[PDB]
Amino acid sequence: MQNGDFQILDYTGLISTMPRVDTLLQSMNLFTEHFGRTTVARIERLDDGAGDIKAV
Amino acid sequence: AKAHVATLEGNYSDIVLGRVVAFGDTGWNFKEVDMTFIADDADADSKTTLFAGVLVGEDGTPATAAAGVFGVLVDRKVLPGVDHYIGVFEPGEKVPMVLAVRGLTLNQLKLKYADGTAIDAAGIQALEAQGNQVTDKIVGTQFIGSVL
């Protein structure tokens, strides 16, 4: 490259940096994905157990 | 809108027309002094007021009188065309400069006092004492419109 209007300079290439991007949690694949249609979602839960049978 | 234009019409060889080359040390002709490159009060981006060929005393102060003539500033930082050093020096900074003192052939016309005014006979006598040959024998040049 030129310097001022009559001299020259040496060019030493570019230097670039970027910040961190952490993907440890994402990499573990813990989460699942579901794709739907509406903006309101429902979930259902069912609880079941057992009984203590006596003698007769 | 006029136009953005720059011009360069001078060289280093047109100030020191020739030397006496020493065998023991090539620096025998030069002395180094400390000079106020950018005026104390001028802003950081102001260009330096020094111009090659000015007559400066041994203490780094440009001479406004014939007595304080000690050498001709021929530093490579103030030669024609070298404008890069803008804002590179703190206002009021003192930076070393190279002066040419002994054993030279010096052009009469390019020597100038601190304020551009040419040098008188007293200046010529004062500078010659260091052992320099101030001469007027320059052919010059003619351009374009001067028939030959």
UniProtKB/TrEMBL annotation, chain A:
It comes from the Viruses. This is Putative major head protein. It comes from Pectobacterium phage phiTE. The chain holds residues 1 to 56 of 332 of the full protein.
Automatic annotation (TrEMBL), chain B:
It holds the Pfam family Phage_DEC_PhiTE. It comes from the Viruses. This is Head stabilization/decoration protein. It comes from Pectobacterium phage phiTE. The lineage of its organism: Viruses, Duplodnaviria, Heunggongvirae, Uroviricota, Caudoviricetes.
